[PDB]
């Protein structure tokens, strides 16, 4: 009526457990080899005698007269890096200045080009991720920039995280303090005329916390031109003003120590040519600015909760509309689950008291190369850093229909959103508990 | 129809609870003794009269006319060390230099050999675990190295955690800062010509966060030869260059205070003979380098979520294909569960501001013995340390079939992946609640 028979052993009734597990010493040796914990074979047999493979011949038979089903809970555990190549978090296109030249007697010829910089897999934490990006902009300048004109003064594109506009005085037209108040509010990207960044093929966008208000329109390009209204205002010549006590004030600090120009639009304007995203969003025209088509969001280092799909092709019936095949990247799905990664949050009031000390701690100002320029400076570390953290996930799918004849060797397969094994799985295993559902 | 009888007590119906518990004062005295919380006996009787053992005679009878089953939830609690012998996290083979000699008139005879260093069980935290490893490399040099030639200058194998390549200038061919930027990115292992490490029999690999892209091929050996492309570049002679203001620059600092050689390949090259894994992974040939067969992963101190299997040989029916036996290491399994250990993550911006202070805090530079050599230095402590932490696990297995005659003494057994009691269990106990499933 509801048996469960196996080769030659006492028949069992009503229910039991078949175990899908990678570890088994025997099968690892033989079976999987060129496989990994995301696409492997395993014997469900569990009987000490019998050579695996020869096991493959045997079968667990759930009484034929009834349609069976089984509860499938699984234990999935990864250890995927915040920033890696497979997830698309190690690359990102941006347009920078390539050459600054003296041409055809009087012309200033500026040549800009798009280029894709890559990051060294792993390096978690958001802030640091920013830094690694800024550094990659530089590392490039080091291989092309300088040796083709282009000064530091005109480095296009830099990810910062502050509100260049806190000091700002509605009359002066300047950041009175003479310094862009060094506190971190949200990541944003700053651009110089003519350049900009593109994330079309990268989840890092999600790390900065900047998304399109219309996601499905593939094409994340944020040009200098887009950051309308909201160019970082200029600094008051704190020195002049004070010593001068008319009043100098109108004097908007044009350079800095080591004399770098703050590219001011004209000898008059209080504004600089440096455009900030964060500004355009909440300080620019809400109806036509950038706030119109992009959204200011919480960072999230994981870069985006993605899901993984399970499949047990040789043991569960194929769900409603999937068709059975043998193409690993199209197997039927039997369970979906978010990919095991969380955002742990910490507190480091030590940030920026630490950037200050961190710089001495790290024997180099590698990230802060321009410790004077109020722009190109090293963005403030925000209190509350986030870090992707891997965690085992004791998930639980529902009862799923089973085949009344379970093969000795079952194939287990965890796929990702785009349907492809996921290299970062360290442990995957599931427990199935069959039971009756109705009869034929 | 569905009774539940016991010796001479009123019959009970429909369900109840039998308790599997180690603590009981009586049985501990008699029964278990030479056993432990992972393989013990216990009386299910729970009746104050009756000498245990004499209890063993009695039996709980679930009505014969029906096939019963019972819900089995358990409470498991361990306290296993991050690094211990049983889990294979206290040893690890590496190949180091044994002797440096002056031979047969003009020959420089270098003799290398493999050797297995061990760690002192317990010592959690990842960073510190690294240190303990580096220290073991040293401790060995202290017993063989020096007293056979081999200088410190040529110590093969050292686990570090930084990106020897941040300063790097695409033209100079040197790390301009004159210092390998002291910030921690990911663990990696550095090697000198001729040596290397092997983890074939160790989970520490998983601690460093370096795995094979093809796990089942038993054999984790990472030779110097493998770390192709990606030898730690050399340092700019910061002193020369500056004082000299042609420009010295090409000058790649050959030694350091206390004069140790940075083994530069030749009087010309800007590269040193020191090869870094982390470099090869993201800075070397992606198609043939190491990134081809190894994967950069998140650390994880636990060294690898492993599972444990339960078994109640004398109380549950043997699941589908297991056969009943009396060999403790083959009992049938009735429930699987991950071994109770998590990765708690913390923030210590105090790292490297602390290594700096930690060294004065610890009255010795035991781990930093070579505070000058930019390589052999003490790796930076990474912000965000991880620590294996034991936690009670209130798990829940499903309803499992029961025998209609439950013995007075049941045997409980928690096994591990390889099937062997697990010494680190402090508390294990379960509650079973039988109930009808169908009739005969």
């Amino acid at each position: 009526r509801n048996s469960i028979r196996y080769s030659e052993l006492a028949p069992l009734f009503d229910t039991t457990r078949v175990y899908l597990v990678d570890n088994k010493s025997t099968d690892v040796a033989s079976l999987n080899y060129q496989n990994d914990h995301s696409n492997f074979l395993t014997t469900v047999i569990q009987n000490n005698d019998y050579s695996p493979g020869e096991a493959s011949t045997q079968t667990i038979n759930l009484d034929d007269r009834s349609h069976w089903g089984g509860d499938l809970k699984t234990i999935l555990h990864t250890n995927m890096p915040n920033v890696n190549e497979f997830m698309f978090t190690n690359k990102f296109k941006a347009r920078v200045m390539v050459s600054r030249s003296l041409t055809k007697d009087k012309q200033v010829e500026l040549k800009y080009e798009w280029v894709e910089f890559t990051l060294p897999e792993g390096n978690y934490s958001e802030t640091m991720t920013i830094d690694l990006m800024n550094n990659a902009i530089v590392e490039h300048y080091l291989k092309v920039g300088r040796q083709n004109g282009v000064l530091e003064s005109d480095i296009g594109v830099k990810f910062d995280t502050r509100n260049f506009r806190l000091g700002f005085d509605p009359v002066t037209g300047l950041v009175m303090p003479g310094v862009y108040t060094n506190e971190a509010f949200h990541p944003d990207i700053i651009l110089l005329p003519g350049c900009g960044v593109d994330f079309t093929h990268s989840r890092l966008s999600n790390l900065l916390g900047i998304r399109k208000r219309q996601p499905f329109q593939e094409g994340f390009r944020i040009t200098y031109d887009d950051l309308e209204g909201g160019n970082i205002p200029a600094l008051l010549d704190v020195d002049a003003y004070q010593a001068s006590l008319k009043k100098p004030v109108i004097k908007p600090l044009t350079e800095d120590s080591k004399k770098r120009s703050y590219n001011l639009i004209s000898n008059d304007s209080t504004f600089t040519q440096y455009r900030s995203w964060y500004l355009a969003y909440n300080y620019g025209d809400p109806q036509t600015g950038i706030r119109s088509w992009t959204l200011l969001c919480t960072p999230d280092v994981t870069c985006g909760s993605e899901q993984v799909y399970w499949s047990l092709p040789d043991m569960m019936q194929d769900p409603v509309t999937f068709r059975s095949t043998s193409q690993i990247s199209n197997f039927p799905v039997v369970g979906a689950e978010l990919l095991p990664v969380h955002s742990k949050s910490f507190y480091n009031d030590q940030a920026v008291y630490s950037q200050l000390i961190r710089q001495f701690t790290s024997l180099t100002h590698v990230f802060n190369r321009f410790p004077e320029n109020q722009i190109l400076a090293r963005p403030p570390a925000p209190t509350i850093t986030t870090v992707s953290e891997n965690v085992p996930a004791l998930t639980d799918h529902g009862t799923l229909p089973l085949r009344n004849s379970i093969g000795g060797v079952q194939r287990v397969t965890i796929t990702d959103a785009r349907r492809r094994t996921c290299p970062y799985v360290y442990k995957a295993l599931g427990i199935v508990s069959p039971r009756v559902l109705s009869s034929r | 129809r569905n009774s539940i009888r016991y010796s001479e007590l009123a019959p009970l119906f429909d369900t109840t609870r039998v308790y599997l518990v180690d603590n009981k004062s009586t049985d501990v005295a008699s029964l278990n003794y030479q056993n432990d919380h992972s393989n013990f006996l216990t009386t299910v009787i729970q009746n104050n009269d009756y000498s245990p053992g004499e209890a063993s005679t009695q039996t709980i009878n679930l009505d014969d006319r029906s096939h019963w089953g019972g819900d089995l939830k358990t409470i498991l609690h361990t306290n296993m060390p991050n690094v211990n012998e049983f889990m294979f996290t206290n040893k690890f083979k590496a190949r180091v230099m044994v002797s440096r000699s002056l031979t047969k008139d003009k020959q420089v005879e270098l003799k290398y050999e493999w050797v297995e260093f061990t760690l002192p069980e317990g010592n959690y935290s990842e960073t510190m675990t690294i240190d303990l490893m580096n220290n073991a490399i040293v401790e060995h040099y202290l017993k063989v190295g020096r007293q056979n030639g081999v200088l410190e200058s040529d110590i093969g194998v050292k686990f570090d955690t930084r990106n020897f390549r941040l300063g790097f200038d695409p033209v100079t061919g040197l790390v301009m800062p004159g210092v390998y930027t002291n910030e921690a990115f990911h663990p990696d292992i550095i090697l000198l010509p001729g040596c290397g490490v092997d983890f074939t029999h160790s989970r520490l690999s998983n601690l460093l966060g370096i795995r094979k892209r093809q796990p089942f091929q038993e054999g984790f050996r990472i030779t110097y030869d493998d770390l192709e492309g990606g030898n730690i570049p050399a340092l700019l002679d910061v002193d020369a260059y500056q004082a000299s203001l042609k420009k010295p620059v090409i000058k790649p600092l050959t030694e350091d205070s206390k004069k140790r050689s940075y083994n530069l390949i030749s009087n010309d090259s800007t590269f040193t003979q020191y090869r870094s894994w982390y470099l090869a992974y993201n800075y070397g040939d992606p198609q043939t380098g190491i990134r081809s067969w190894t994967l950069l992963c998140t650390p994880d101190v636990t060294c690898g979520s492993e599972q444990v299997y339960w078994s109640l040989p004398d109380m549950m029916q043997d699941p589908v294909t297991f056969r009943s036996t009396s060999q403790i290491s083959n009992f049938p399994v009735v429930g699987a569960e991950l071994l109770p250990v998590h990765s708690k993550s913390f923030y210590n911006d105090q790292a490297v501001y602390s290594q700096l202070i930690r060294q004065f805090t610890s009255l010795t530079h035991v781990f930093n013995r070579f505070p000058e050599n930019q390589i052999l230095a003490r790796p930076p402590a990474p912000t965000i340390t991880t620590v294996s932490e034991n936690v009670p696990a209130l798990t829940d297995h499903g309803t499992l079939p029961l025998r209609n005659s439950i013995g007075g003494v049941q045997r409980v057994t928690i096994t591990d992946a390889r099937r062997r009691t697990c010494p680190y269990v402090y508390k294990a106990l379960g509650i079973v609640s039988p109930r009808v499933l169908s009739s005969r």
């Binding site: 530089v138 300048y141 080091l142 300088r146 530091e152 080591k258 100002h365 190369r369 321009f370 410790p371 004077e372 | 300063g167 200038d169 100079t172 301009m176 800062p177 700019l236 910061v238 260059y241 500056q242 420009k247 620059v249």
Partner: peptide, 10 residues
């Protein structure tokens, strides 16, 4: 005429 792009002073 070579920019090391690094503030050696401080």
């Amino acid at each position: 005429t070579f920019n090391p792009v690094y503030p050696y002073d401080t």
